[PDB]
Amino acid sequence: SGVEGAAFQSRLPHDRMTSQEAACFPDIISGPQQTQKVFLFIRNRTLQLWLDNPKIQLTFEATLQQLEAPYNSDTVLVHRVHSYLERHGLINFGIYKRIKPLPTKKTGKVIIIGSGVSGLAAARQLQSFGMDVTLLEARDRVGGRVATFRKGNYVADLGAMVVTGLGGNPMAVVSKQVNMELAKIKQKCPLYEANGQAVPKEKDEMVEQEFNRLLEATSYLSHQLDFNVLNNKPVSLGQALEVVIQLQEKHVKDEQIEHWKKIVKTQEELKELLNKMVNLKEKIKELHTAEFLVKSKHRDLTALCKEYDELAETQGKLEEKLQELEANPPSDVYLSSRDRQILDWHFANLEFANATPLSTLSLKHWDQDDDFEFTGSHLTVRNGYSCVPVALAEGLDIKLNTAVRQVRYTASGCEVIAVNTRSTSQTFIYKCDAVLCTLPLGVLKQQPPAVQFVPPLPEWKTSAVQRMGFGNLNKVVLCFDRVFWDPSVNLFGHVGSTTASRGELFLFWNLAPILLALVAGEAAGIMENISDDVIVGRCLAILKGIFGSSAVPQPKETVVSRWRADPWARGSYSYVAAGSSGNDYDLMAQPITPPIPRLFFAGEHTIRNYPATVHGALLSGLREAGRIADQFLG
Numbered sequence: 001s002g003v004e005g006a007a008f009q010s011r012l013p014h015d016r017m018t019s020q021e022a023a024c025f026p027d028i029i030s031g032p033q034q035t036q037k038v039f040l041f042i043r044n045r046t047l048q049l050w051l052d053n054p055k056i057q058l059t060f061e062a063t064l065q066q067l068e069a070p071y072n073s074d075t076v077l078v079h080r081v082h083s084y085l086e087r088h089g090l091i092n093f094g095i096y097k098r099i100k101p102l103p104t105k106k107t108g109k110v111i112i113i114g115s116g117v118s119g120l121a122a123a124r125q126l127q128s129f130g131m132d133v134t135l136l137e138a139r140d141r142v143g144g145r146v147a148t149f150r151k152g153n154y155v156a157d158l159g160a161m162v163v164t165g166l167g168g169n170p171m172a173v174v175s176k177q178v179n180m181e182l183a184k185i186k187q188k189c190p191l192y193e194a195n196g197q198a199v200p201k202e203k204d205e206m207v208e209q210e211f212n213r214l215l216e217a218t219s220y221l222s223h224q225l226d227f228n229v230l231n232n233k234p235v236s237l238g239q240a241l242e243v244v245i246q247l248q249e250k251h252v253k254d255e256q257i258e259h260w261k262k263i264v265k266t267q268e269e270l271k272e273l274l275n276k277m278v279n280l281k282e283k284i285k286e287l288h289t290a291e292f293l294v295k296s297k298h299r300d301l302t303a304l305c306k307e308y309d310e311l312a313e314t315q316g317k318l319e320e321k322l323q324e325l326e327a328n329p330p331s332d333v334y335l336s337s338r339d340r341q342i343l344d345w346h347f348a349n350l351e352f353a354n355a356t357p358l359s360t361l362s363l364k365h366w367d368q369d370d371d372f373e374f375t376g377s378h379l380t381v382r383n384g385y386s387c388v389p390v391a392l393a394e395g396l397d398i399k400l401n402t403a404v405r406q407v408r409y410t411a412s413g414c415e416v417i418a419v420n421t422r423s424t425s426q427t428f429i430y431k432c433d434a435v436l437c438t439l440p441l442g443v444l445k446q447q448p449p450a451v452q453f454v455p456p457l458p459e460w461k462t463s464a465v466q467r468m469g470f471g472n473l474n475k476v477v478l479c480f481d482r483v484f485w486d487p488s489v490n491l492f493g494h495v496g497s498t499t500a501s502r503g504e505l506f507l508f509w510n511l512a513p514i515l516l517a518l519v520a521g522e523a524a525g526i527m528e529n530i531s532d533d534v535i536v537g538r539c540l541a542i543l544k545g546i547f548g549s550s551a552v553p554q555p556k557e558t559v560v561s562r563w564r565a566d567p568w569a570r571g572s573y574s575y576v577a578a579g580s581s582g583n584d585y586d587l588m589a590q591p592i593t594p595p596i597p598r599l600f601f602a603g604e605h606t607i608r609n610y611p612a613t614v615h616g617a618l619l620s621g622l623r624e625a626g627r628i629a630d631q632f633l634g
């Protein structure tokens with residue numbers, strides 16, 4: 001599975017041609033299947049050669065010399081496959097030693113707005129393709145939403161921190177190229193209630209199980225029964241979850257009522273059987289030849305005692321049924337008050353991963369990209385994720401503290417206007433043939449706008465911008481000079497007191513003596529209005545309740561993100577809002593033409609299968625580089 005592995009690691013089926021390939025190789029698709037098999041092998045083998053050694057450029061010549069007979073004889077097919085893989089960034093992407101040209105002459109000028117991972121990835125491709133490219137970045141650093149805090153021996157990521165599995169992840173290649181150290185995240189996450197006591201194992205698993213059944217029930221309601229619209233409004237995941245919970249509570253109350261009726265019935269029978277027994281005793285009373293009269297009262301009294309003694313047995317078969325029934329009552333409630341708070345911790349955790357309250361997520365599409373998840377454990381970046389954007393910036397023409405304010409594009413070229421953010425007096429004007437916009441969705445949604453488009457973007461584009469969600473989440477970095485927590489535990493949770501505030505500092509994690517506290521959901525935007533000192537104080541109180549007031553010292557350093565207030569972000573990353581879908585991600589990727597595409601788009605919000613991630617941003621950049629090169633360089 002070597003060549004089979006290369007296709008998989010490249011997100012491609014090893015045994016068939018993708019739609020994109022069919023388009024580029026119409027003669028292969030509509031030809032001898034035997035040729036397709038040769039195409040797929042050359043493609044898979046070329047990807048393998050690249051994947052086995054991504055720190056060095058894989059040339060056409062070298063691909064040909066390493067292919068085996070007969071493949072090494074079809075020079076022309078190999079060239080076409082290598083050119084295709086290269087143009088689209090499946091090989092020779094990221095950071096690697098070139099071993100050939102980098103023509104001193106440059107064809108075409110492209111301006112790239114934003115120097116985040118998508119802009120950086122696209123730039124390296126475009127430059128290696130021989131175009132003249134310049135990146136305009138508003139901040140005084142590269143990386144965008146990859147933002148690493150570094151002081152002394154302290155390292156912590158305020159932006160992206162997790163590599164979500166290596167299997168199929170292009171970040172696996174990049175990780176090798178920049179030598180970024182990755183470490184698995186242990187899953188064990190003990191939970192502590194608001195009073196500091198740990199949630200027992202049995203309870204933990206019970207609630208988690210319900211969390212899972214609840215989500216599965218909404219998935220069933222949505223994709224099997226199609227209940228995605230109600231009162232002419234798209235249903236949200238949070239809305240559906242609350243209804244499923246209501247049904248559970250109704251069911252519990254129903255079974256409770258039936259059990260009470262069983263009790264009351266049994267009680268009524270006992271009461272009645274008792275009354276007839278009392279009346280029979282009274283009959284036995286009254287009832288209480290001479291020789292014959294004796295035998296006669298005998299058969300009479302014994303007939304009434306064959307009646308009464310028996311009545312006492314059917315009575316014992318009732319007092320038995322009763323006492324059982326009320327020893328085996330059904331559940332009193334679906335979720336106890338505490339149980340619900342623990343369930344809210346799992347919802348808070350989901351709001352964290354999705355960067356938004358559950359009531360804003362599309363029930364039908366929120367998890368639209370699951371089928372593309374990578375395989376493998378999730379890893380964290382020991383030395384800080386900024387090592388990637390920093391290494392990708394090597395050798396590019398990047399203009400920092402340069403905030404773009406207007407993008408003008410015509411059938412003859414474009415102009416990008418920006419201003420120095422250190423001296424808002426001077427305004428630069430950069431002319432070019434094409435503009436690649438990597439501005440965050442949050443910035444594109446800004447009202448009044450942060451950057452004007454002349455002409456204004458089409459309605460089909462802006463309405464997509466408006467429908468799509470742009471979430472938020474924050475982190476508080478607590479640097480200590482000591483480790484007072486369990487070092488064999490990477491994560492531990494804090495169960496809040498209310499549903500509304502379930503996302504407040506609900507999670508803590510480590511890996512130096514550093515703890516990060518996470519703020520999710522509704523709490524994420526609200527907490528940004530609290531000073532660092534006060535938020536830090538709330539963290540310590542929580543930690544003190546867990547570990548003990550004397551075990552928790554004051555932090556040496558703290559850093560608090562406020563992604564929604566950050567003007568260059570306006571949030572953390574997108575999410576499929578109620579009323580949107582995977583299609584808006586495609587609409588966001590569509591280039592704008594004045595009869596030749598001039599304005600292009602990349603960014604995590606323009607890639608349908610991998611949104612809201614660093615790998616998605618990277619792939620979107622590789623994608624646009626290819627589309628732009630195809631237009632200008634042929």
Ligand SMILES: Cc1cc2nc3c(=O)[nH]c(=O)nc-3n(C[C@H](O)[C@H](O)[C@H](O)COP(=O)(O)OP(=O)(O)OC[C@H]3O[C@@H](n4cnc5c(N)ncnc54)[C@H](O)[C@@H]3O)c2cc1C
Nearest residue numbers: 114116118138144145160161162404572603604613614617
């Ligand atoms: C808190 C947080 C946690 C996250 N965790 C993870 C994670 O664990 N794993 C994962 O894979 N992803 C994670 N993500 C998402 C991931 O970081 C992003 O999807 C990705 O980095 C986006 O890259 P981008 O190039 O699309 O956008 P950006 O990185 O935002 O790049 C856009 C650039 O445009 C610049 N800019 C803005 N306005 C202007 C202007 N007017 N003129 C010029 N420049 C401008 C911005 O400064 C920025 O540099 C997280 C994001 C956040 C914020």
